[PDB]
C-alpha cells in the first residue's frame, strides 16, 4: 500500500549549562533508520538499520553537515521565540519540528507535511495543499509575514515533492527485504477468574508488522464499544509489535463472546472464541 | 535525505 518518510527534530534549552540539547531521528514507515544526538561523542549522523549502511562517505558527510545546520537554526529559533513571548532567561523551553512525505501504491507523490511547535503547542504549519501557511496565535503572524515575503513555502514544496520521493523510492528499493515485508499477528486468548463470579477474557496479538492493527470484541453480533479495555500498541524491541484487548464477563457466558482481529497481513479478518 | 535547501529561521 502506501509508504512514508518522516523526520523529527527536537531541541531543548538548558539555561544554565552548555548548548541546547538537539536530537534528530528519521523513520521509513515504522522503522527508524538514522539518528543524531548532540550529546554523543561521535558528533556524526549514525545508521540504525542494516540496509542504510551501503551509502558512501559523501552521503554521511552531507547528512551530518546539514543536520548540524538544522541544530543551529533551532538554537536561533529558541533565542528569538523567547523574545516574542516575553519570558525570562532562566526557564527551559523546547522547539519541535517535523517534515516528510507520503507515496501511494504506484510510488507517486501523495502528500507532504511540515510543522513547527513551541513548548508542545502548535505554532506554524504548512497547509495540506503546500502553498500557504497556518499560524495559530498572534506571535506567529510576524513569522508568517516574514516567510510569506521570501517564498519559503515553495523552497520547501520543491523538496517535499521531488527529492523526498526520490529518496523514499531509493530506500524502498534498497531495503525491499525488510521494508516491504508483512507479518501476521499470532493471536490467542486467555481466561482469568477474578475472585469467584466474574472473569476476564483477553485476546492478544503478537509479533506483527506494520503497527496498524484493529481489535474488536463482540457478543453475538453486539459491538461492545464499552466494558472493554485495550492498551496502546507497544513495540517489542525487535521491530515487531504487541497488543491485547480484555473484557470482563459473568461466568458461563464465555462462548457468547468473541474477538475479531484485522491486520494488513491477514487475507481475511480472524475470529477467536474460547476453546 | 534531509532537506537540502536554504535554512530559514522563525
Amino acid at each position, epitope marked *: 500500500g502506501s509508504h512514508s518518510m518522516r523526520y523529527f527534530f527536537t531541541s531543548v534549552s538548558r539555561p544554565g549549562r552548555g548548548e541546547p540539547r538537539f536530537i534528530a531521528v528519521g523513520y521509513v514507515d515504522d522503522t527508524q533508520f538514522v539518528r543524531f544526538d548532540s550529546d554523543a561523542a561521535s558528533q556524526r549522523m549514525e545508521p540504525r538499520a542494516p540496509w542504510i549502511e551501503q551509502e*558512501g*562517505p*559523501e*552521503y554521511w*558527510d*552531507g547528512e551530518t*553537515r*546539514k543536520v548540524k545546520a538544522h541544530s543551529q537554526t533551532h538554537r536561533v529559533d529558541l533565542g528569538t521565540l523567547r523574545g516574542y513571548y516575553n519570558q525570562s532567561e532562566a526557564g527551559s523551553h523546547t522547539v519541535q519540528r517535523m517534515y516528510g512525505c507520503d507515496v501511494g501504491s504506484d510510488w507517486r507523490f501523495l502528500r507532504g507535511y511540515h510543522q513547527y511547535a513551541y513548548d508542545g503547542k502548535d505554532y506554524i504549519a504548512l497547509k495540506e495543499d503546500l502553498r500557504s501557511w497556518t499560524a495559530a496565535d498572534m506571535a506567529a503572524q510576524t513569522t508568517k509575514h516574514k516567510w510569506e515575503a521570501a*517564498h519559503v513555502a*515553495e*523552497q520547501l*514544496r*520543491a*523538496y517535499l515533492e*521531488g*527529492t523526498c520521493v*526520490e*529518496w523514499l*523510492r*531509493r530506500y524502498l528499493e534498497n531495503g525491499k527485504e525488510t521494508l516491504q515485508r508483512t507479518d501476521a499477528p499470532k493471536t490467542h486468548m486467555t481466561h482469568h477468574a477474578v475472585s469467584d463470579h466474574e472473569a476476564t477474557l483477553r485476546c492478544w496479538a503478537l509479533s506483527f508488522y506494520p503497527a496498524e492493527i484493529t481489535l474488536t470484541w463482540q457478543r453475538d453480533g453486539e459491538d461492545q464499544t464499552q466494558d472493554t479495555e485495550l492498551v496502546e500498541t507497544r513495540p517489542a524491541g525487535d521491530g515487531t509489535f504487541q497488543k491485547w484487548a480484555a473484557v470482563v464477563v459473568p461466568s458461563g457466558q464465555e462462548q457468547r463472546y468473541t474477538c475479531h482481529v484485522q491486520h494488513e497481513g491477514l487475507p481475511k479478518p480472524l475470529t477467536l472464541r474460547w476453546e | *535525505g534531509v532537506y*537540502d*535547501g*536554504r535554512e530559514h529561521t522563525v
Partner: antibody, heavy 112, light 114 residues
Framework: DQVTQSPEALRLQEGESSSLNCSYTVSGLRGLFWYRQDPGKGPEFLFTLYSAGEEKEKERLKATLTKKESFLHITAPKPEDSATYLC??????????????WGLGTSLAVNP | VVSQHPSWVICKSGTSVKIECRSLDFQATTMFWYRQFPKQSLMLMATSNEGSKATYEQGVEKDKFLINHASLTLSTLTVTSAHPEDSSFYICSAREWGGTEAFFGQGTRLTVVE
C-alpha cells in the same frame, strides 16, 4: 536533455517592452536559474524559480515559471541592459549528483 | 562572493598553470569548473563534490587537468602540460547545499604561446 531558448538574438529601441522565454522538458525541475553574462566577465546571477506558478520581480526585470516554459519580461530597457541572458535547469536526483542543462543564450542589443 | 586568482595568465608552452577558486560568504559543498572559448557558449569541464574525487566530462582528458578540493572553501585547477590550444576563458562556480543556486567568479583569461 531539452532546453531551448529563443529568440537567438534581439534588437530593441530604448523604452520598448519585450520578453524572452526558455522552453524545457524534464522529469525533474528541482530549480530553474536565470543568469546574465557580459562579454568578458563571469555570469551574474539574476533569478531562481523553484516551483511552477510564482513570479519574481527585480528593479526592472520580471520572471515567471509555468509547467512548460519560463518568461523573462524586460520593461523600458536602457542601453546598458545589453548582455547574454542564460537559462539553466537542475533535474531531480536522489543525491543531486546530476549536472545542469544550459540554454545557449540570447544576445540582447538596445539601441538609443 | 566567489573570487579567482590569478585573473590573467601567460606562459611558455611546456609549463604548468595553477588557478584557484577561493569561496567566500559560505562553505561551498560543490565546485564546478567551466571553460569558454571565444565567441562560443559555456562548456562544463568538471565537478567536485564535498571531499570526494572529481567527476570529469567526456572530452576533458583527466591526465591534462587536475582538480584538488583540499578544503571546503578552496578548489584548485591545474593544467599540467600547457599547449597553445588551451588558450581559453576559465570560470569557476560554487554552491552550498545541493538545492541552492551557484555563484560564478570573474573568469580567468589564459593565453599560452610557444
Amino acid at each position: 536533455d531539452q532546453v531551448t531558448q529563443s529568440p537567438e538574438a534581439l534588437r530593441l529601441q530604448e523604452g520598448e517592452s519585450s520578453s524572452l522565454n526558455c522552453s524545457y522538458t524534464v522529469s525533474g525541475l528541482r530549480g530553474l536559474f536565470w543568469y546574465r553574462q557580459d562579454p568578458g566577465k563571469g555570469p551574474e546571477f539574476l533569478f531562481t524559480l523553484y516551483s511552477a506558478g510564482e513570479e519574481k520581480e527585480k528593479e526592472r526585470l520580471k520572471a515567471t515559471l509555468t509547467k512548460k516554459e519560463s518568461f523573462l519580461h524586460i520593461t523600458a530597457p536602457k542601453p546598458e541592459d545589453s548582455a547574454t541572458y542564460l537559462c539553466a535547469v537542475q533535474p531531480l536526483n536522489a543525491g543531486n549528483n546530476r549536472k545542469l542543462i544550459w540554454g545557449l543564450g540570447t544576445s540582447l542589443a538596445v539601441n538609443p | 562572493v566567489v573570487s579567482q586568482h590569478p585573473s590573467w595568465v601567460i606562459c611558455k608552452s611546456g609549463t604548468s598553470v595553477k588557478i584557484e577558486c577561493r569561496s567566500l560568504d559560505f562553505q561551498a559543498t560543490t565546485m564546478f569548473w567551466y571553460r569558454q572559448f571565444p565567441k562560443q557558449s559555456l562548456m562544463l569541464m568538471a565537478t567536485s563534490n564535498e571531499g570526494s574525487k572529481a567527476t570529469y566530462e567526456q572530452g576533458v582528458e583527466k591526465d591534462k587537468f587536475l582538480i584538488n578540493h583540499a578544503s571546503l572553501t578552496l578548489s584548485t585547477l591545474t593544467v599540467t602540460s600547457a599547449h597553445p590550444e588551451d588558450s581559453s576563458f576559465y570560470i569557476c562556480s560554487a554552491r552550498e547545499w545541493g538545492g541552492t543556486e551557484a555563484f560564478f567568479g570573474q573568469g580567468t583569461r589564459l593565453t599560452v604561446v610557444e
